[PDB]
Amino acid sequence: NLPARICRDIELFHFDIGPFENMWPGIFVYMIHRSCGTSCFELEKLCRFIMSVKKNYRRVPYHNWKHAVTVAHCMYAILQNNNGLFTDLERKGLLIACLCHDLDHRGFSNSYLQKFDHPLAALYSTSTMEQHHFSQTVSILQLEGHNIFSTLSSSEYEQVLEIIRKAIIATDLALYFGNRKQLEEMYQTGSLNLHNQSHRDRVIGLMMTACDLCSVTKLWPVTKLTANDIYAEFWAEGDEMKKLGIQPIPMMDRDKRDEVPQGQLGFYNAVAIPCYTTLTQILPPTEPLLKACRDNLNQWEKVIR
Ligand SMILES: COc1cc2ncnc(N3CCC[C@@H](c4ccccc4)C3)c2cc1OCCc1ccc2ccccc2n1
Numbered sequence: 366n367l368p369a370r371i372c373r374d375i376e377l378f379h380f381d382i383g384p385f386e387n388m389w390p391g392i393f394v395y396m397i398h399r400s401c402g403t404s405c406f407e408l409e410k411l412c413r414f415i416m417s418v419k420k421n422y423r424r425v426p427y428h429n430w431k432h433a434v435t436v437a438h439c440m441y442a443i444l445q446n447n448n449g450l451f452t453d454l455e456r457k458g459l460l461i462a463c464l465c466h467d468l469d470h471r472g473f474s475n476s477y478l479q480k481f482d483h484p485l486a487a488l489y490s491t492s493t494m495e496q497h498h499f500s501q502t503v504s505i506l507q508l509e510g511h512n513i514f515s516t517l518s519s520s521e522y523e524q525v526l527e528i529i530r531k532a533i534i535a536t537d538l539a540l541y542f543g544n545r546k547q548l549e550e551m552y553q554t555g556s557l558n559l560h561n562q563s564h565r566d567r568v569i570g571l572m573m574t575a576c577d578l579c580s581v582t583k584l585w586p587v588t589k590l591t592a593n594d595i596y597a598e599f600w601a602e603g604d605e606m607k608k609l610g611i612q613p614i615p616m617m618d619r620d621k622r623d624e625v626p627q628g629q630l631g632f633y634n635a636v637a638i639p640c641y642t643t644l645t646q647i648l649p650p651t652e653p654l655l656k657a658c659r660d661n662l663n664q665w666e667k668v669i670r
Pocket residue numbers: 538578580581592595615616617621622624625626627628629631632635636
């Protein structure tokens with residue numbers, strides 16, 4: 366069962382899941398049963414599914430099993446503070462999408478895969494690794510005793526898989542810029558309609574981005590340490606770009622590491638702040654994410670001074 370401190374702290378947007386890996390499944394089970402009912406998901410099947418998902422994450426610095434559960438927690442907190450907006454089915458799908466969205470991630474971007482001429486880039490031209498993460502999710506669901514959705518109708522099964530596919534694909538940050546621009550225009554013209562499936566899919570897309578980027582919404586000591594893991598992958602990809610004979614972008618070039626604070630500023634300005642600002646406009650109870658993001662922007666500004 367869940368320790369008292371976790372029981373309380375799990376409801377905070379800036380919760381950190383801790384360094385004990387064997388506790389994470391229980392944290393995920395608690396979140397999905399609190400969000401979607403103890404009804405649905407036979408415990409045994411869910412646990413089996415969870416353990417296989419874990420097994421298919423890699424021991425990379427950032428896009429690892431810990432990241433999956435952390436992204437799932439952020440989604441939990443959004444859903445807990447916006448009661449009555451999403452269906453039981455959506456809530457289950459979104460939480461599973463979050464757990465699975467980075468399956469088999471090797472710590473390299475779609476861009477590197479393209480430049481490498483990796484076989485995945487020939488299979489899936491755009492959102493290469495995300496299409497792969499979704500395929501891996503379906504493959505795991507298809508394993509004996511792993512169908513956590515087995516009690517759903519055929520129609521609901523197809524429904525939930527589609528929710529998951531769109532949610533995983535939306536974690537391709539390249540898609541975020543256009544998604545956010547459209548949502549913002551709809552907000553400002555007052556035409557956003559959550560009963561319109563296309564608008565709804567967009568809002569879910571932004572939620573997925575907001576959860577994926579959530580390191581910037583933790584408290585500063587957590588944000589700062591997490592940035593170390595983020596750069597560890599970027600710099601490893603930059604080394605690999607150099608090995609292909611391509612000069613990496615500055616963000617991936619360890620020779621430019623002294624410019625991290627300026628790079629962070631750019632990221633918060635162009636990506637993080639607009640993302641959480643748009644999210645708060647649509648879902649006001651997500652305000653704490655924006656506040657924490659702004660606090661971290663200030664800390665980065667403080668580093669530069
Ligand atoms: C939480 O941190 C980051 C988290 C990120 N999470 C996901 N993707 C990122 N990249 C993807 C490619 C585009 C990039 C981007 C887009 C617009 C504006 C800036 C960056 C975001 C992230 C960049 C981050 O920060 C990296 C920031 C950065 C940018 C340039 C740099 C240049 C030199 C040194 C460090 C640098 N660091």
